[PDB]
Write a protein that binds this DNA or RNA. Structure first.
Ligand code: MG
Ligand code: MG
Ligand code: MG
Ligand code: MG
Ligand code: MG
Ligand code: MG
Ligand code: MG
Ligand code: MG
Ligand code: MG
Ligand code: MG
Ligand code: MG
Ligand code: MG
Ligand code: MG
Ligand code: MG
Ligand code: MG
Ligand code: MG
Ligand code: MG
Ligand code: MG
Ligand code: MG
Ligand code: MG
Ligand code: MG
Ligand code: MG
Ligand code: MG
Ligand code: MG
Ligand code: MG
Ligand code: MG
Ligand code: MG
Ligand code: MG
Ligand code: MG
Ligand code: MG
Ligand code: MG
Ligand code: MG
Ligand code: MG
Ligand code: MG
Ligand code: MG
Ligand code: MG
Ligand code: MG
Ligand code: MG
Ligand code: MG
Ligand code: MG
Ligand code: MG
Ligand code: MG
Ligand code: MG
Ligand code: MG
Ligand code: MG
Ligand code: MG
Ligand code: MG
Ligand code: MG
Lengths: 42, 90, 273
RNA sequence: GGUAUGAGUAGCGAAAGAAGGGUGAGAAUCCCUUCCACCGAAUAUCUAAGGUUUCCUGAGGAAGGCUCGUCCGCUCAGGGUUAGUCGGGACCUAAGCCGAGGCCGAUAGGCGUAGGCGAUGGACAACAGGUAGAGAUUCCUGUACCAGUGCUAAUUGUUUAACCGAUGGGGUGACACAGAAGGAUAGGGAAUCGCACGAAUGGAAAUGUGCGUCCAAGCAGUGAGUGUGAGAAGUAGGCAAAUCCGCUUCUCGCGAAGCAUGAGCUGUGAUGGGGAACGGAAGUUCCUGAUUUCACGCUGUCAAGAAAAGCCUCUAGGAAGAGUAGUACUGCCCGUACCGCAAACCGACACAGGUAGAUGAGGAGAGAAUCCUAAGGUGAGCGAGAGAACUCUCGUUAAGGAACUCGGCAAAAUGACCCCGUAACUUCGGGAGAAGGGGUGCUCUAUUAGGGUGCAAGCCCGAGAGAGCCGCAGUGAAUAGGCCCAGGCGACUGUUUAGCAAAAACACAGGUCUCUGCAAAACCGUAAGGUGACGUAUAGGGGCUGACGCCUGCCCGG
RNA sequence: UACCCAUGUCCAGGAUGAAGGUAAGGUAAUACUUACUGGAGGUCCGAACCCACGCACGUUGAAAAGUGCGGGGAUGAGGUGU
């Protein structure tokens, strides 16, 4: 039994866009990934 | 408008096999409800629609020389006209 | 009465239980039930703040009338019921006007008895009066501290307090602990010892039974490492190698008094226990 | 970064293949056939997750595939997923999360009320056939149901108020665990019936062989049963009100009725559908029988067992339209392919690992064990020889029998059922399967006696004995305890160093000390707010000791 | 992964026979005895399942902790899903 037991819901609830937006530090992360120019935020 | 909702007919072995059964397969706007498709088909073709079945197709991933990407997502509507209703031609 | 189980297993070997003789129904009053979820000693931060709680049997809360407000109207004791939330049994009171309430079941409270609350209530067991109305020497329970707040002080199985005197707008009560303190005289109490007094004799018998009651195991400080507990560490068993036995959070824990030194209620305590 | 060396070396990832035919430039490896072999409480059938096109068809054979390759989960093209009723949303709430105002706080923010979100739970209407390169309770056929809508027709109502009816009241919804006995039905089996055959090598025209031996929801009946004293008055309660609930009193009392529920059954559905054989026959009776259902129904226990919507009812309110029948019409969005004990998911791999749930046949059996099989699935992506050392995994072994070794480590032995018999000690439960012994196949008496089932017919189960008969051996295979004596430690079942320690360590019931009078002490937090506890000294926190028995001495100078 | 919360779900088969109950005795009434009933348990044996005691093997592994043969628990201080 390995780490990484995927769940669509758990992935979005923990790491998704709306969760990131819901906190100030979450928004810092989005701002940082936009600054680096990532294709994929969240 | 009605001709926004109905994009184009679908011509395949499957689509062409059910024309004799008075079932007409269209590619319809991805936002169009099967109710909007019913009333659009009636406006465009002057027919009486018995039922509309609808299905969403997700985009198919296609490569072309180290560039990969998805074809368009499609919404396919099968429109059954009534016995008394006139046919659509294709 | 206490039933002693025969030693058919090492688990049952010294176990004892209530016979639940006093219980008259196994079915609570549906209207007086509230949901109750286990907290398992966790705060509003989700952090464990009290150790050794978690994972007992599911329970429903029974709404208990600790206020005993319903003055004048007679209440017939309809049943004595098991309450998983407290050591005492509870009694369903059918009031003559068709209101049902639960009270703490006093010792000697029988189905069919009638109870009253207020100034005209007799000094008969499950009756509730203001302390100014209760004779000196009477044995009471479910004592309120602030008028109309509800009984807080002597509620657990088998406990009882005694009215000692009447000193101004205050009555002197000897509480179950043997502390003598002043209660405001417009506070009310119920007459009689609480009931289910056998409760303390029960031998839980096996580890599992403590787990059903929601108690998780206690680990002794002296078998923890030094980063976990002041008693932690040492090669082999160690004595308490400290000037005092300590709590897990420092602080001496044998004799060290913890009642706040400058306590507002100190003026109402006449004899400490 | 490139390229050597080791080296044509290690390895090629658990397993049964064979031949004939085909295809093709080319074949151990692709296709077909036949035989053989393997799984079969799975290596079968569903299905959630997860994956995301891997699915189907046609081309292909650079690379990928541990070999090969004409083949592929690979490459390239086209295709493929159909819902009022299935699962999710337009319904409900749990944990939890967010949270207008609010409380708290250098900033940021933290907390929290109303109110929301949130299934893993509640509620909620469709079945059987057909069809097929790829979907099907979705398409088609037949027959339904749920919620609406208009249109006809009567009917009744239109201010002592048909009817609707709360965002309010009440009831239900609404719940643990264990056990026992039943009813029924799935399933299983045997005869019966139908159809086909009549046979290779000695025999058989039949106790012969093979194959088959039926069907939905809905609608209308019924029904094992399971619960449930009814009626009337009267009202300090149910935030107003109440005809409803609750409470009281009175009359009438009974395992009888009603009233609720209720598996299943019978009709219809069906002149239909399916069916052993381009065709359409039989559908019966009996036995067995659930891990399903009636149903957490009943009984018991203590550890005392969600909520909300929904549904029903009550009024407060709103009201000229309302229902009934018939007719035809209306019913949105999302998912639907395929894999799913796996080569498609998690493990970098086409990886001996991991992956919830439903179903899971027969013989013998208590059984989902075991061995062999059914349905169904599979022969495992290197092979051909050889049959040295050595290694691993196995089988056997003269005489001896622990002499081995740190140590009987390993292996051997024991093993099922029935019967006999069973010590010290003991907390009286145990110890105990102690130990130690004996039996076990087949035939006849024998549709035995005697059970179960049934109206019968029959069908099933079935001892004890007597005679006999074969083997070296009868739980003839497979699967099933080795035992005893004595001591240390720990009372006990539990727990632990994921990946070198499972223990004498931890825990534990019990003991004791101590703190704590409730805005408790203790604990988290700057605080608010919390836990403690919706508890209240028979309670809660902390220290030490650790079942039970007998006990627990002296010292208070530090 | 640890603990916890809410809500689900799983545990073939067999064995034993606690309390309680009933009936006989028994007694002034009781203790009590015997039989039947009853179905308790961190109960017993044993698959699934969970675990990980011994040994072997593996040790540029089939595997960055496994496999094989034995082993322990298996209605609970149980396992497991969301
Ligand atoms: Mg990953
Ligand atoms: Mg759809
Ligand atoms: Mg504690
Ligand atoms: Mg340690
Ligand atoms: Mg240490
Ligand atoms: Mg320290
Ligand atoms: Mg120390
Ligand atoms: Mg020492
Ligand atoms: Mg070499
Ligand atoms: Mg070599
Ligand atoms: Mg080699
Ligand atoms: Mg291989
Ligand atoms: Mg098996
Ligand atoms: Mg394919
Ligand atoms: Mg190759
Ligand atoms: Mg090909
Ligand atoms: Mg909540
Ligand atoms: Mg709320
Ligand atoms: Mg929601
Ligand atoms: Mg398919
Ligand atoms: Mg259709
Ligand atoms: Mg309830
Ligand atoms: Mg499918
Ligand atoms: Mg694999
Ligand atoms: Mg598992
Ligand atoms: Mg087969
Ligand atoms: Mg020998
Ligand atoms: Mg010999
Ligand atoms: Mg020796
Ligand atoms: Mg030697
Ligand atoms: Mg030696
Ligand atoms: Mg030695
Ligand atoms: Mg050994
Ligand atoms: Mg023996
Ligand atoms: Mg045998
Ligand atoms: Mg131990
Ligand atoms: Mg143990
Ligand atoms: Mg370790
Ligand atoms: Mg170990
Ligand atoms: Mg506080
Ligand atoms: Mg100790
Ligand atoms: Mg203790
Ligand atoms: Mg759970
Ligand atoms: Mg056990
Ligand atoms: Mg060891
Ligand atoms: Mg094993
Ligand atoms: Mg054991
Ligand atoms: Mg066992």
């Amino acid at each position: 039994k390995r780490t990484y037991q995927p769940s669509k819901r758990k992935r979005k609830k923990v790491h998704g866009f709306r969760t990131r937006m819901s906190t100030k530090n979450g928004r810092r992360v989005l701002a940082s990934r936009r600054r680096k120019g990532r294709k994929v935020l969240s | 408008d009605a001709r926004d909702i109905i994009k184009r007919p679908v011509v395949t072995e499957e689509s062409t096999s059910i024309l004799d059964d008075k079932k007409y397969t269209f590619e319809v706007d991805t936002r169009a409800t099967k109710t909007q498709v019913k009333y659009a088909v009636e406006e465009i073709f002057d027919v009486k629609v018995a039922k509309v079945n609808v299905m969403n197709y997700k985009g198919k991933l296609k490569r072309m020389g180290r560039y990969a990407g998805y074809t368009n997502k499609r919404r396919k509507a099968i429109v059954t006209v009534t016995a008394d209703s006139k046919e659509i031609q294709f | 009465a206490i039933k002693k189980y025969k030693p058919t297993t090492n688990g049952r070997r010294h176990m004892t239980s209530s016979d639940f003789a006093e219980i008259t129904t196994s079915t609570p009053e549906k209207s007086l039930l509230r949901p109750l979820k286990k907290k398992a000693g966790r705060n509003n931060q989700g952090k464990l703040t009290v150790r050794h709680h978690g994972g007992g049997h599911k329970r429903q809360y029974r709404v208990i009338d600790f206020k005993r407000n319903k003055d004048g109207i007679p209440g017939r004791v309809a049943t004595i019921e098991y309450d998983p939330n407290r050591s005492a049994n509870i009694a369903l009171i059918n009031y003559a006007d068709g209101e049902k309430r639960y009270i703490i079941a006093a010792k000697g409270l029988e189905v069919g008895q009638t109870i009253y609350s207020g100034a005209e209530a007799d000094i008969k067991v499950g009756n509730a009066l203001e302390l100014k109305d209760i004779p000196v020497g009477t044995v009471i329970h479910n004592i309120e501290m602030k008028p109309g707040k509800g009984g807080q002080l002597v509620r657990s199985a088998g406990t009882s307090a005694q009215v000692l005197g009447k000193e101004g707008k205050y009555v002197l009560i000897r509480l179950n602990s043997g502390e003598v303190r002043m209660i405001l005289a417009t506070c009310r109490a119920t007459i009689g010892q609480v009931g289910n007094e056998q409760h303390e004799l029960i031998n839980i018998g096996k580890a599992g039974r403590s787990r059903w009651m929601g108690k998780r195991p206690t680990v002794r400080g002296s078998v923890m490492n030094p980063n976990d507990h002041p008693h932690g560490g040492g090669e082999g068993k160690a004595p308490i190698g400290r000037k005092s036995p300590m709590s897990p959070w420092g602080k001496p824990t044998l004799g060290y008094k913890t009642r706040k030194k400058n306590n507002n209620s100190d003026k109402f305590i006449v004899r400490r226990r």
